[PDB]
Amino acid sequence: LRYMSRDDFRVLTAVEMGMKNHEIVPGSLIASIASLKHGGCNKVLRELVKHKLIAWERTKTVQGYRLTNAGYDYLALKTLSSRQVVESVGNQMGVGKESDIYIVANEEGQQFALKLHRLGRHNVSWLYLSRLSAMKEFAYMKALYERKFPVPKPIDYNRHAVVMELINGYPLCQIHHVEDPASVYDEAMELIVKLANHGLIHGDFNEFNLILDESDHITMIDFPQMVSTSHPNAEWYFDRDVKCIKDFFMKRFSYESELFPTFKDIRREDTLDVESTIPPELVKQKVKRQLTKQQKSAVRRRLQKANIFTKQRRENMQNIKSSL
Amino acid sequence: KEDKRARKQAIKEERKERRVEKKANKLAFKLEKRRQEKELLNLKKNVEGLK
Amino acid sequence: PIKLARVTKVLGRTGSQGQCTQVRVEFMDDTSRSIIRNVKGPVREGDVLTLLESEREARRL
Amino acid sequence: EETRKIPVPANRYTPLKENWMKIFTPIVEHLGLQIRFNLKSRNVEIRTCKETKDVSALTKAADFVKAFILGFQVEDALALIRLDDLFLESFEITDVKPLKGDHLSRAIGRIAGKGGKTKFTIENVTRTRIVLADVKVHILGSFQNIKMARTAICNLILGNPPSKVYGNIRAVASRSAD
RNA sequence: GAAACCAAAGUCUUUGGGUUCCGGGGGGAGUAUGGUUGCAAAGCUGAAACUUAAAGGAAUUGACGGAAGGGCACCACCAGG
Numbered sequence: 290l291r292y293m294s295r296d297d298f299r300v301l302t303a304v305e306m307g308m309k310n311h312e313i314v315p316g317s318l319i320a321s322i323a324s325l326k327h328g329g330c331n332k333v334l335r336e337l338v339k340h341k342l343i344a345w346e347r348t349k350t351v352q353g354y355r356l357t358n359a360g361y362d363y364l365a366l367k368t369l370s371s372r373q374v375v376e377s378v379g380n381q382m383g384v385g386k387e388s389d390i391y392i393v394a395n396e397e398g399q400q401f402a403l404k405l406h407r408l409g410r411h412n413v414s415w416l417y418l419s420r421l422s423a424m425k426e427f428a429y430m431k432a433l434y435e436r437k438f439p440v441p442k443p444i445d446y447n448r449h450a451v452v453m454e455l456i457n458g459y460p461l462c463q464i465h466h467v468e469d470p471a472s473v474y475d476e477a478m479e480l481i482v483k484l485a486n487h488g489l490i491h492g493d494f495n496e497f498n499l500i501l502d503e504s505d506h507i508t509m510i511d512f513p514q515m516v517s518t519s520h521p522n523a524e525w526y527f528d529r530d531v532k533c534i535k536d537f538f539m540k541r542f543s544y545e546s547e548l549f550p551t552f553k554d555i556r557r558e559d560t561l562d563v564e565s566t567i568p569p570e571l572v573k574q575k576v577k578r579q580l581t582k583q584q585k586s587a588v589r590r591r592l593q594k595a596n597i598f599t600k601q602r603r604e605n606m607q608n609i610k611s612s613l
Numbered sequence: 614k615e616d617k618r619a620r621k622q623a624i625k626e627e628r629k630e631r632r633v634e635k636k637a638n639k640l641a642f643k644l645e646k647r648r649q650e651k652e653l654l655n656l657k658k659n660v661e662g663l664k
Numbered sequence: 665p666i667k668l669a670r671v672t673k674v675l676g677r678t679g680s681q682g683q684c685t686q687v688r689v690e691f692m693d694d695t696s697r698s699i700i701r702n703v704k705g706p707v708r709e710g711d712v713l714t715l716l717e718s719e720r721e722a723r724r725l
Numbered sequence: 726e727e728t729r730k731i732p733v734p735a736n737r738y739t740p741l742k743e744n745w746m747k748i749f750t751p752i753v754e755h756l757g758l759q760i761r762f763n764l765k766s767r768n769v770e771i772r773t774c775k776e777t778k779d780v781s782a783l784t785k786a787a788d789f790v791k792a793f794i795l796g797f798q799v800e801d802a803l804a805l806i807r808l809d810d811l812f813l814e815s816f817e818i819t820d821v822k823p824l825k826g827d828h829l830s831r832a833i834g835r836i837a838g839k840g841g842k843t844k845f846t847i848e849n850v851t852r853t854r855i856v857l858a859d860v861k862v863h864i865l866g867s868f869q870n871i872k873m874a875r876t877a878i879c880n881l882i883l884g885n886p887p888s889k890v891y892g893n894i895r896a897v898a899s900r901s902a903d
Numbered sequence: 904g905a906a907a908c909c910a911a912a913g914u915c916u917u918u919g920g921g922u923u924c925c926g927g928g929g930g931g932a933g934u935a936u937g938g939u940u941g942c943a944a945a946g947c948u949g950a951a952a953c954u955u956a957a958a959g960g961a962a963u964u965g966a967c968g969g970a971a972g973g974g975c976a977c978c979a980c981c982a983g984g
């Protein structure tokens with residue numbers, strides 16, 4: 290965990306800004322764009338590599354450092370802590386290969402869920418696609434909670450991380466016996482009708498994605514793949530989902546269906562398928578920005594001054610002298 | 614005439630005042646940059662160190 | 665309306681995964697309409713097909 | 726019976742003379758039209774006859790010979806004879822951008838590139854044929870393909886380097902459902 | 904000739920045909936000040952303190968392409984078990 294909270298923020302955000310333009314970031318750029326402390330940043334990077342925060346990269350000529358997955362996770366968690374959202378960690382690990390579930394607790398002690406997108410060419414594309422997936426998933430959760438669907442309340446997001454409302458329960462697959470199958474089944478077709486009314490069709494609406502909150506409430510998650518009803522294949526996905534729910538109910542709980550909704554109703558709800566006149570203070574600020582720009586250029590071109598080549602040349606000269 | 618001429622001379626007077634304002638802004642920026650460069654040089658010479 | 669067909673010449677393999685065969689079709693309505701279509705599965709020179717609709721023409725040019 | 730006459734320039738006389746049989750053989754065999762070359766008026770004249778198969782074949786012949794005279798190869802206008810939806814947009818280089826003298830010449834250069842390769846590169850992406858007269862550009866292809874080639878050429882003669890042109894035209898070809 | 908190139912950028916350590924302007928590592932800086940001209944915009948002349956181990960000019964190979972084409976594989980896919 291974190292102990293010192295002074296300059297890992299600035300160095301790691303400098304690494305993040307380095308990753309946005311190119312693969313492997315030299316230390317000169319980090320020292321130029323993180324200018325609060327100078328000289329001691331080498332030992333800061335030496336302290337970061339003892340964890341899995343950053344990683345060195347020196348193959349034949351390129352010499353730099355890159356951000357790892359755990360460093361990005363701690364960066365998002367630090368940004369959440371700056372928002373006063375996470376204080377302690379609950380270790381109920383939902384270990385998935387597409388997402389990691391970590392319980393969090395705020396200063397008030399109220400527990401929330403934390404979704405960390407792990408997607409699995411090097412890992413910069415993995416982190417960027419994780420960021421895009423987290424952004425679109427947060428947008429989808431916001432839309433579904435605005436449309437009053439039975440989903441948790443979204444709380445916050447930071448660049449891959451989603452702090453999300455916590456509801457305890459088990460998925461519908463590993464609940465062997467249900468006392469009232471008919472009521473929750475009718476509610477399931479009610480939710481299917483609601484989703485189809487909202488200009489949306491799931492495509493892979495599975496029972497494993499349905500979490501039984503105390504076997505009384507339905508919790509629904511995992512919408513990166515959410516598609517439109519304007520597609521000609523939309524009703525085929527809708528009928529596939531309906532038949533999947535039907536065969537699951539006549540196959541697992543031994544309960545036979547009574548209502549058979551086959552309605553395509555688009556779009557009677559919201560179309561979510563798209564979803565000295567200048568004062569001297571300004572003069573001072575502009576001149577300060579200019580002089581910081583020239584001194585940042587100077588710091589860049591001074592920090593950009595390969596000792597491995599000089600060491601190899603010295604070794605070659607010494608070997609030529611001692612061998613001839 | 615006496616309307617187009619008035620409009621043209623109003624635009625000319627507006628431009629003249631605008632150029633005077635721009636010249637004042639340029640001289641103010643030059644003076645402030647000069648005194649800030651003097652302050653940066655004084656920082657370079659003294660009040661820079663540890664003890 | 666359902667029309668019978670005939671394979672005149674197999675042209676090639678099309679599709680993303682190379683799963684479709686682009687073929688030429690001759691009509692059994694005593695007409696010389698040789699229309700280039702796309703089929704799925706194994707076809708050889710001399711096969712006979714059943715077209716649900718004939719007014720559609722496949723990907724030409 | 727009706728006829729169309731089209732002119733020929735002085736620099737296009739010899740390619741017309743050399744490729745004459747390849748011109749008039751598909752005109753007289755598959756289309757069934759009478760053709761001659763009036764030397765006094767220097768015009769290729771094509772007329773319909775009694776054994777012409779159908780209407781609008783005379784316009785096909787006129788498009789074929791006019792495309793050959795503009796500078797296209799004889800096969801590239803035989804494509805006009807066979808295919809239906811092929812058109813000819815042509816435009817001056819000074820139309821989109823006022824260029825004078827040597828600058829204008831350099832624009833011509835970056836339509837050709839080194840060895841003509843850039844030009845041929847567009848002919849691989851837009852699936853068209855393009856002919857450069859001294860200040861003029863002619864495109865033969867489908868309508869969306871002609872528009873794609875025209876955007877590429879206008880991007881070239883506004884100063885953009887060939888690398889940006891190749892990247893943009895390949896992206897547009899990717900979104901064109903080809 | 905450092906070369907790309909140049910019948911001149913040649914007749915240069917075998918260095919002298921006449922003559923005008925003008926450069927002296929990169930910045931500061933064509934900046935401040937002074938003078939002069941202009942209605943103005945600005946033009947002409949034009950520093951220093953200080954900063955810096957470099958900045959540049961020609962060519963020579965090609966990691967890496969987010970550049971393009973081909974070929975191969977059920978430790979890739981398609982249709983399947």
